[PDB]
Amino acid sequence: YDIQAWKKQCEELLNLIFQCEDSEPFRQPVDLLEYPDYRDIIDTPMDFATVRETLEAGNYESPMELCKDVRLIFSNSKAYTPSKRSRIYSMSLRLSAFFEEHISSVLSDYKSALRFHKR
Numbered sequence: 001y002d003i004q005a006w007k008k009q010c011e012e013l014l015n016l017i018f019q020c021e022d023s024e025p026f027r028q029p030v031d032l033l034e035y036p037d038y039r040d041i042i043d044t045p046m047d048f049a050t051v052r053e054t055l056e057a058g059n060y061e062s063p064m065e066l067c068k069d070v071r072l073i074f075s076n077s078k079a080y081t082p083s084k085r086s087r088i089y090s091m092s093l094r095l096s097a098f099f100e101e102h103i104s105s106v107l108s109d110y111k112s113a114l115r116f117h118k119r
């Protein structure tokens with residue numbers, strides 16, 4: 001029932017994401033020189049270094065907030081892709097499936113710890 005355990009669990013999950021090849025297009029903010037119309041379609045850019053830095057700065061209060069920002073990386077990729085068969089969008093779908101598979105226990109354990117605290 002460790003209320004703070006989600007933080008290190010999220011740091012480890014971000015390490016796994018950074019290690020895999022599929023994360024390369026999403027590790028740093030999108031390069032507007034590579035994609036000049038990016039901010040005409042995407043309102044809020046997000047990338048894994050910004051998520052990691054926000055976590056390390058102590059600027060997430062819960063794993064749900066981290067999960068919302070990681071989900072925004074994937075929804076931005078889906079909104080920007082000209083095709084659902086594109087290379088970069090295909091990488092985002094694989095990364096999203098891996099992320100969701102692992103974040104589920106982080107969220108469940110955190111919410112369980114809070115309930116135990118408020119029992």
Ligand SMILES: CCOc1ccc(CC(=O)O)cc1
Pocket residue numbers: 025026030035076077078080081082083086087088089
């Ligand atoms: C991380 C930058 O985000 C993306 C860049 C390009 C595409 C679309 C494409 O294949 O050109 C999809 C997402």
Ligand SMILES: CCOc1ccc(CC(=O)O)cc1
Pocket residue numbers: 016017020021022023091094095098
């Ligand atoms: C032990 C870590 O194993 C994996 C890591 C990342 C992915 C996600 C992806 O490659 O897109 C899948 C499996």
